Design a protein around this ligand. Structure first.
Ligand code: NA
Ligand code: NA
Lengths: 134, 156, 156, 134
């Protein structure tokens, strides 16, 4: 699974996600990646999110939209919402993985509860950061 | 806030004791190259939607990541690919699931967004819509890599 | 206090184009199905079994666009979809794009109950269901003259 | 499109949705009915919801989970959440249709913004109510 999120100079947020699924997948199984609100969500009023993990749990938990609702309705910060969804709510349902997210203010979060997540980010005109472990 | 981008190439399938430094270096190089292209597009004033679309197209083309070229194999030794894109301005979205003959699933997803009244298309119906709009039909063999095939046999 | 609600669709209803005989058939059908569910709840049947049975009945009833009585696609075919979710476990099952399963809601429940997945589509969903004993049917079984006449009016 | 929501004597909530789609549909199109959080959602802590309408907008708006999030995070009542989603938010996106919902307290709601919605409901032990028009 791969994904990207961005905030552009005009204040717009977008998100995108793509996958080949899982090795040895049952043909016809669909995980969170193509499902709006599960593996991909963007709303200029709150946040842009792209996920990667245990497909079934990100769907049942509507992880991408949940970040947004937590922020918009719960008043949580991007960091508090990411913490709650990735570090508490998903492992509680047997889920593992992570996500990337940018809020309408420009805050960036790349939470994951696994040993690794291939990831990178950066502001326009600046040096990017890349990551695998940690 | 300034313009910014983040990308990912998958969480979970990563173990330091099972990785080598030349492999880690290839991943860092690819992530850096793609996030940099996104940064420069943002700096140049491109839209958030065009940026994420391009970044995920590049991640699909890259055989290191499980999306597009480089996709894992199903148990039938096929490739089934899925993708989504969403525009936070209009809240329009486009998605495809279970496609095998489209080189870049995220471009098909954007096509569903941009050139149809719909949000999600699946399977051969999704492929036939995309061909009708001029997208190329490819053989699913093009996504195949030895590395992912060996992984399927190892799982077996 | 146990309780059930059902629906047969919003949108395709215009008092000006309906007849009283028509409206009474729908009321009668809605009555009987909700009554069956109420009785099930009072008898201590689970919420999950009640919504599953209720939608099964709505699928079987040709007056409603689900199962028997499904509308026709552009190609004069039927493509059916269904979902079921258990608020206790938060498990869910779903099928989309199936045409050889008589009761999609029962196939959706099969996905949630007899697999670790949430969503299956198309022929893979059908093959999974068949392998577990669900009968294969021809999609002609869903066809009704009323929905075919609507298709031809649509191509007006 | 058809659906059902139920609260049983043990306190469990469940939802189900099934459809044939739209007359003259483009083959392969998927609307909200099979998508968790869009056309079908259930959570014992909040609500069970089944939707019917212009599929694309209920997906974009994640209508079923939004009722749940408005109630659970937002503190809205079932009726307030139903009003916000069906009568304000969906029509703003160009969406028509309605939903059925039951909350963990046994409240029931059948909102719609269309001319009609085939519907019925009833508490166990009572006589049922059926409806077609407003
Ligand atoms: Na790739
Ligand atoms: Na029916």
């Amino acid at each position: 699974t791969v994904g990207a999120v961005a905030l552009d100079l005009d204040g717009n947020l977008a998100a995108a996600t793509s996958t080949g699924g899982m090795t040895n997948k049952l043909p016809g199984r669909v995980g969170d990646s193509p499902l709006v609100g599960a593996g991909c969500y963007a709303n200029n009023a709150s946040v842009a999110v792209s996920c990667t993990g245990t497909g079934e749990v990100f769907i049942r938990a509507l992880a991408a939209y949940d970040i947004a609702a937590l922020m918009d309705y719960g008043g949580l910060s991007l960091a508090e919402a990411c913490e709650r969804v990735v570090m508490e709510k998903l492992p509680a349902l047997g889920g593992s993985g992570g996500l990337i997210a940018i809020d309408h203010e420009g805050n960036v979060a790349l939470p994951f509860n696994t040993e690794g997540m291939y990831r990178a980010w950066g502001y326009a005109g600046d040096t990017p950061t890349t990551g695998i472990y940690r | 806030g300034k313009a910014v981008i983040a990308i990912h190439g998958g969480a979970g399938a990563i173990s330091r004791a099972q990785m080598s430094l030349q492999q880690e270096l290839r991943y860092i190089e690819a992530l850096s190259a793609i996030v940099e292209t996104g940064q420069k597009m943002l700096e140049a004033g491109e839209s958030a939607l065009d940026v994420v679309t391009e970044a995920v197209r590049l991640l699909e083309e890259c055989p290191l990541f499980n999306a597009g070229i480089g996709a894992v194999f199903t148990r039938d030794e096929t490739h089934e690919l899925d993708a989504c894109v969403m525009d936070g301005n209009t809240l329009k979205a486009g998605a495809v699931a279970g496609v095998s003959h489209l080189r870049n699933p995220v471009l098909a997803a954007r096509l569903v967004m941009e050139q149809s009244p719909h949000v999600m298309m699946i399977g051969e119906g999704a492929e036939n819509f995309a061909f009708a709009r001029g997208m190329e039909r490819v053989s699913p063999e093009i996504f195949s890599t030895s590395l992912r095939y060996e992984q399927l046999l190892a799982a077996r």
